[PDB]
Amino acid sequence: GYYYHSFPNTVTIPCHHIRLGDFLMLQGRPCQVIRISTSNATGQYRYLGVDLFTKQLHEESSFVSNPAPSVIVQTMLGPVFKQYRVLDMQGGHIVAMTETGDVKQSLPVIDQSNLWSRLSTAFESRGSVRVLVLNDSGRELAVDMKVIH
Template sequence: MSSHSERHHHHAEFFGKKVDEFFHPIETAQKKIAKSYYAKSQNGYAPVETITITKKQPVRSFGPPPTAPVAPPAQTDFSIPCHLLRVGDLVILQKRPTQIIRITTSAATGQHRYLGVDLFTHKLIEENCVVSHPSPSVVLHTMLTPAFKQYKVIQAGEDIPLYLQTEAGELKTGVAVVAQGDLTKKINDAFGNSPGAVRVLVISDGTQELIVDFKRVHGDYKL
């Protein structure tokens, strides 16, 4: 076959394929796919390599790990002007909760001096008030008084243990009651008349608690 005939044959075959692809696109594509799979099977088809992508972890800076915020401790005392204190009130003397039994005032300086009884150890404690000068013309005389906790009375009465409930819902028993003023009988009578509406006021010296007073709350209800 001459070179002219060969070129004519190749051109006819090329244009024939293009015309076939144009008029029969789906069948042509299927033939190409089948031919490709056949060639792979003849040459030994190798599976496609899988690629695993891992998320890069952020680089952590040096230093202590972050910590959760911690709630501040509950306040155990607060200051009060000396002219508001009276005999029988509770104050902090020498870092101890005490009840005032005597108040004296210096005529020269106006400074107050307190004598009290430790509510837990029953020892006498004496201390002067705190004097501060926030401005040249102002002089403040203050003392620390204990902060009270309020516990709900759950059970009370003669020959019955006193059961209390804290604000967090914890049940407590065996908390001592101050001996002055027949307070235990007053709490029992108040609970008998208004169960569920009685709250006791409690102070602490850091290791033990003591009931020093009580009150009734509005909205009495039966347990």
């Protein structure tokens, strides 16, 4: 929103800031966007994405909000990520630890954009590596990485 005018574990993203490859909630599912089009009927943006967990395709159109006179905004929802430290890497999954010390013994890593390989080289050469983590009804998934500098 803004000052208050408004547009779970999701943030509102204006559509002009959405690009191919971004993660969005489509039909309630975390997806990587693979196509952006415009509806002939409504003129709104339409998003086609691949579910990060199930790999199924989902489509959803933007939501048009009009919170104030002459303010008209198309938005989608994106997921909120958690950042965990990486303590160990064993056979496609990692031992991670949260900001408060909570150990996650077997966190799977998404098979996407060479993440396991990029994570391993960054881990091999550990303290500065973080994983970005999404949750699907209790199921956590490492979907990206970050080296803190």
